[PDB]
Amino acid sequence: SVPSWPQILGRLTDNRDLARGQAAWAMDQIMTGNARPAQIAAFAVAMTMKAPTADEVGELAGVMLSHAHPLPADTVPDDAVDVVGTGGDGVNTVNLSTMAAIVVAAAGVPVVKHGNRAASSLSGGADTLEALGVRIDLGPDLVARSLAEVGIGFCFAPRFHPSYRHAAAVRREIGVPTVFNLLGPLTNPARPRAGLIGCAFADLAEVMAGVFAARRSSVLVVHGDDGLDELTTTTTSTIWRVAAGSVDKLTFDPAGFGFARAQLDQLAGGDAQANAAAVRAVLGGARGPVRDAVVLNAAGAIVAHAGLSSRAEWLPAWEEGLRRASAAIDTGAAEQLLARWVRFGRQIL
Amino acid sequence: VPSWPQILGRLTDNRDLARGQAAWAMDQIMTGNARPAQIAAFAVAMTMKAPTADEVGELAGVMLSHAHPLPADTVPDDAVDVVGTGGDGVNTVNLSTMAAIVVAAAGVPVVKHGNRAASSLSGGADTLEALGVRIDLGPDLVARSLAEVGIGFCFAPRFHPSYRHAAAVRREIGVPTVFNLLGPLTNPARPRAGLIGCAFADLAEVMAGVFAARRSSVLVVHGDDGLDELTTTTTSTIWRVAAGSVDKLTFDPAGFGFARAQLDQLAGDAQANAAAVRAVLGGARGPVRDAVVLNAAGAIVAHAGLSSRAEWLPAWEEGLRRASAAIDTGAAEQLLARWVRFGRQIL
Ligand SMILES: [Mg+2]
- Written in H, E and C, the secondary structure of B250-308 is EECHHHHCCCCCCHHHCCCEHHHHHHHHHHHHHCCCCHHHHHHHHHHHHHHHHHHHHHC
Describe the strand order of the beta sheet including B193-197 as a list of residue ranges.
B151-155, B110-114, B80-84, B193-197, B217-223, B236-242, B245-251
Contact A119, A348 (CB under 8 A): no
- Residues A31 and A47: their CA atoms lie apart, in Å, by 17
User: CA A95, A101, A107, A109: dihedral to nearest 10 degrees?
Assistant: 170
Q: Distance, CA B347 to ligand 1 centroid (Å)?
A: 67
Q: Matching CATH topology for B1-67 and B76-347? A: no
Q: Who's near B329: CB < 8 A, 6+ residues apart?
A: none
CA angle A83, A88, A94 (to 5 degrees): 55
CA angle A270, A273, A276 (to 5 degrees): 90
Show me where the domains of chain A are located.
1-68, 77-349
- Residues A152 and A340: their CA atoms lie apart, in Å, by 10
- Residues B64 and B187: their CA atoms lie apart, in Å, by 8
Rg (CA), chain B: 19
- Residues B113 and B128: their CA atoms lie apart, in Å, by 12
Quote the CATH superfamily of domain A1-68: Transferase, Pyrimidine Nucleoside Phosphorylase; Chain C (1.20.970.10)
Q: How many C-alpha atoms does B1 have within 13 Å on its Cβ side?
A: 0
Tally helices (H) and strands (E) across chain A: 15, 7
Q: CB atoms < 10 A from the CB of A347, how many?
A: 10
**Looking at beta carbons, which residues of chain B come within 8 Å of A174?**
4-5, 8, 37-38, 41
DSSP designation for B3: -
**Looking at beta carbons, which residues of chain B come within 8 Å of A37?**
35-37, 40
Can you point out the beta strands (E) in chain A? 81-85, 111-115, 152-156, 194-198, 218-224, 237-243, 246-252
Size of interface A-B (CB pairs under 8 A): 94
3-class secondary structure, A74: coil
**Looking at beta carbons, which residues of chain A come within 8 Å of B178?**
none
Query: In terms of C-beta distances under 8 Å and separation of at least 24 residues, what long-range contacts does A124-128 make, across chains too?
Result: A124/A95, A125/A84, A125/A95, A125/A97, A125/A98, A126/A154, A126/A156, A127/A272, A127/A275, A128/A95, A128/A98, A128/A272, A128/A275, A128/A276, A128/A279
- Residues A29 and A35: their CA atoms lie apart, in Å, by 5
**Looking at beta carbons, which residues of chain A come within 8 Å of B175?**
5-6, 9-10, 13, 42
**B238: enclosing H helix or E strand:** strand B236-242
- Residues A325 and A283: their CA atoms lie apart, in Å, by 11
Handedness of CA A39, A44, A49, A51 (dihedral sign): positive
Nearest alpha-carbon partner for A91 in A251, A267, A291, A295: A267
User: CA B2, B7, B13, B18: dihedral to nearest 10 degrees?
Assistant: 60
CATH 3.40.1030.10 is the classification of domain A77-349: yes
- Residues B90 and B286: their CA atoms lie apart, in Å, by 19
CA A237 to chain centre: 17
Which CATH code for domain B76-347? 3.40.1030.10
Interchain CB distance below 8 Å, A176 and B40 = no
Measure A88 CA to nearest chain B CA, in Å. Answer: 11
C-alpha dist (Å) from residue B171 to A7, B44, B177: 13, 13, 11
Quote the CATH superfamily of domain B1-67: Transferase, Pyrimidine Nucleoside Phosphorylase; Chain C (1.20.970.10)
Packing angle between helix A5-13 and helix B164-173, nearest 10 degrees?
90
Interchain CB distance below 8 Å, B41 and A4 = no
Name the residue type at position B115: N
- Residues B200 and B92: their CA atoms lie apart, in Å, by 14
Q: State in Å, rounded, how far the first CA of chain B is from the last one.
A: 51
Q: How is A255-318 classified by DSSP, letter by letter?
A: GGGTPPPPPGGGGB---HHHHHHHHHHHHTT--SHHHHHHHHHHHHHHHHHHTTT----HHHHH
**Looking at beta carbons, which residues of chain B come within 8 Å of A46?**
44, 48
Instruction: Show the DSSP H helices in chain B as ranges.
Output: 4-12, 21-30, 36-49, 53-65, 93-105, 124-130, 139-148, 156-159, 164-173, 182-185, 201-212, 270-282, 287-307, 312-328, 331-344
- Residues A244 and A221: their CA atoms lie apart, in Å, by 15
Burial annotation B24-43 (CB, 10 A radius, 16+ → b, else e): bbbbbbbeeebbbbbbbbbb
Q: How many C-alpha atoms does B261 have within 13 Å on its Cβ side?
A: 22
DSSP designation for A72: P
Contact A275, A121 (CB under 8 A): no
Of A9, A36, A174, the CB nearest to B4: A174
User: CA B248, B254, B257, B262: dihedral to nearest 10 degrees?
Assistant: 120
Contact B135, B155 (CB under 8 A): yes
User: CA B65, B69, B75, B80: dihedral to nearest 10 degrees?
Assistant: -50
Q: What are phi and psi of B110, to 5 degrees?
A: -125, 135
**B220: enclosing H helix or E strand:** strand B217-223
Q: Who's near B264: CB < 8 A, 6+ residues apart?
A: none
Q: Is A6 exposed, middle or buried (0-12, 13-18, 19+ CB in 10 A)?
A: exposed
Packing angle between helix A165-174 and helix B36-49, nearest 10 degrees?
60
Burial annotation A134-173 (CB, 10 A radius, 16+ → b, else e): bbbebebeebbbbbeebbbbbbbbebbbeebebbbebbeb
Name the residue type at position B175: V
Nearest alpha-carbon partner for B206 in B85, B64, B82, B112: B85
- Residues A41 and A175: their CA atoms lie apart, in Å, by 10
Interface residue of B3, B15, B28, B48 to substitute, partner A, most A CBs within 10 Å: B48
Q: Is B96 exposed, middle or buried (0-12, 13-18, 19+ CB in 10 A)?
A: buried
DSSP designation for A227: S
Name the residue type at position B293: V
Nearest alpha-carbon partner for B155 in B183, B121, B120: B183
DSSP designation for B121: B
CA angle A332, A338, A340 (to 5 degrees): 95
Contact A239, A222 (CB under 8 A): yes
Q: State in Å, rounded, how far the first CA of chain A is from the last one.
A: 54
Query: Residues of B near A (CB-CB distance < 8 A)?
Result: 3-5, 8-9, 12, 14, 35-41, 43-45, 47-49, 169, 172-177
Q: Who's near B129: CB < 8 A, 6+ residues apart?
A: B116, B135, B270
Contact B228, B215 (CB under 8 A): no
Query: Residues of A near B (CB-CB distance < 8 A)?
Result: 4-6, 9-10, 13, 15, 36-42, 44-46, 48-50, 170, 173-178
Contact A111, A152 (CB under 8 A): yes
DSSP designation for A70: P
Measure A64 CA to nearest chain B CA, in Å. Answer: 20
